[PDB]
Amino acid sequence: RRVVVTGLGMVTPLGRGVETTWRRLIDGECGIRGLTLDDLKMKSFDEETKLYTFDQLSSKVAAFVPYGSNPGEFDEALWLNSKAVANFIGYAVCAADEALRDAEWLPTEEEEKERTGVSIGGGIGSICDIVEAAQLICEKRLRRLSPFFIPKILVNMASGHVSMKYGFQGPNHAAVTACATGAHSIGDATRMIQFGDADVMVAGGTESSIDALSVAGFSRSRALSTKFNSSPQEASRPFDCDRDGFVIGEGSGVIVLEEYEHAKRRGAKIYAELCGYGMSGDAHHITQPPEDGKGAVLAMTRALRQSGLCPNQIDYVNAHATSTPIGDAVEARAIKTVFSEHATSGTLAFSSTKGATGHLLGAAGAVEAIFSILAIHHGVAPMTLNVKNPDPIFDKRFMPLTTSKKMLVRTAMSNSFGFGGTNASLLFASI
């Protein structure tokens, strides 16, 4: 059975909603800004502690979702109106609602509901809530501990809330694979529709981990940018010689997947087909990828094999490149190994959009799958921001896009690599 995409939904640092997010992306906007004390998410702590904590953060930049009741903004009064709903859950529900309405899939009949599943995973969940609760132990004020604490920190709850809201009784699933979470969640959902576990799946990823401990943690791992704290708009620069770590972002990406015949029967407009779901493991290091990028090569190759397409048949690649010294170079190297001539000649189009959205972690793979689907749908490939001095590996021919260019895009591949060497590559095609 074939699987197509009939609905898109998302909330990102470029805005709430696919239309607004895509328009701003293409036009070259950036959602990164400088951190403030409010961004620590430490409302339960005194100012002295906030000030101290802020100063301990090496990375002071991030990509935030715009809150508000205005158009293009995420309304917390609408999506975060429950004690059991953490931010990552609200982002997921917000995005899923847009996607479902886009696909016009809000069934009332039990049979349709029973054949609809959910697979939206979260990468970390809600460290903020855990820190607040932990503070209760340090200060001996456990009486404040809420019964909704456990429910709101479980990374699988984003999927639970979406199914409960729409009555979806099909597979209630969640894949958690660090920075690849969004990809595997969509991939697993696709495997489920293929096998027959469901006819419709609402899948994607969500992440809301911009806070004191999250920033301190990733900084301690030396994975975040710190060189451009005074110039945030220049912090995320995938493939650029001056990159020094990724910029933490937040948001969610959700798509509606469904069996091909099912979509045609009801006359739904189809964005594209999901033809490849390549998975692999680096089996190398907990945080660093192999110099040869074998894992990345495997993921992309497996996705190709599954689609029955040759390397030269791929028009666009949305690179994972998070603006990391080693990471970005390894992927560029893997792209050369996989597409060889097709890439070295300049025929292949590829870019990273994290320069604009930042690294959405658990949601990165979902949002980027949406961008890949949209490139095919609109025949426009997004630019890579801040590539002032291309990495030595690139040249006059093999070079990432630095401007959003019009072009026919019948096939698009999106890569996602997370900590622990977990790799996934999603391949989409027009149908």
Supply the residues annotated as catalytic. 179, 320, 359
> Does residue 67 belong to the site contacting a second copy (CB under 8 A)?
no
Two tokens, residue 153: 């920190």
Question: Does residue 169 touch a second copy according to CB under 8 A?
Answer: yes
CA distance 166 to 105: 10
Determine if 164 is a binding residue for a second copy (CB under 8 A): yes
Q: Nearest distance from residue 375's CB to K ion, in Å?
A: 11
Phi first, then psi: what are they for 253, rounded to 5°?
Answer: -135, 125
- Half-sphere exposure (Cβ direction) of 55: Cα atoms closer than 13 Å: 6
Between CA 87 and CA 96, with CA 92 as vertex, the angle to 5 degrees is 150
Does position 287 interact with a second copy (CB under 8 A)? The reply is: yes
In the shown chain, the binding pattern of residues 268 to 307 toward K ion, with x for contact by CB under 5 A and - for none, equals: ----------------------------------------
The angle at the Cα of 305, spanning 302 to 311, to the nearest 5 degrees, equals 95
**188 binding a second copy? (CB under 8 A):** yes
Which does residue 377 touch among K ion, a second copy, none (CB within 5 to 8 A, set by kind)? none
Positive/negative CA dihedral, 277, 175, 366, 224? negative
- Of K ion, a second copy, none, which one sits near residue 368, judging by CB under 5 to 8 A according to partner kind? K ion
Where are the alpha helices (H) located in 254-363, listed in sequence order? 260-265, 294-307, 325-339, 341-344, 354-357
**Judged by CB under 8 A, which of 114, 337, 379, 431 binds a second copy?**
114
Residue with Cβ nearer a second copy (94 or 118): 118
* Sites for a second copy among residues 388-427 (CB under 8 A): 418-423
Element (H, E) at 429: strand 422-429
Choose, by CB under 8 A, the member of 173, 237, 359, 377 that binds a second copy.
173
- Does the footprint of K ion cover residue 331 (CB under 5 A)? no
Query: For K ion, which residue has the nearest CB?
Result: 368
Q: Does 49 engage in binding with a second copy (CB under 8 A)?
A: yes
Helix (H) / strand (E) element for 154: namely none
Q: Examine residue 244 and tell whether it contacts a second copy (CB under 8 A).
A: no
Q: Looking at residue 189, what DSSP letter applies?
A: H
- The residue (of 23 and 113) whose beta carbon lies closer to a second copy is 113
Q: Is 20 in the site for K ion (CB under 5 A)?
A: no
- Neighbouring residues of 126: CB distance < 8 A, sequence distance ≥ 6: 86, 87, 88, 152, 153, 208, 209
The verdict on 105 binding a second copy (CB under 8 A) reads: no
* Binders in 27-46 for a second copy, by CB under 8 A: 42, 45
Cα 57 from chain centroid (whole Å): 24
User: What CA–CA distance (Å, rounded) separates 426 from 5?
Assistant: 13
Structure tokens at 165: 């809201």
Give the residue, chosen from 15, 17, 31, 117, that forms a contact with a second copy under the rule CB under 8 A: 117
Closest to 202 in 3D by CA, of 415, 5, 371, 370: 5
Binding site partner of 408, from K ion, a second copy, none, Cβ cut-off 5-8 A by kind? none
Q: From the list 102, 112, 250, 368, which residue makes contact with K ion (rule: CB under 5 A)?
A: 368
Residue ranges binding K ion (CB under 5 A): 318, 320, 368, 414-415
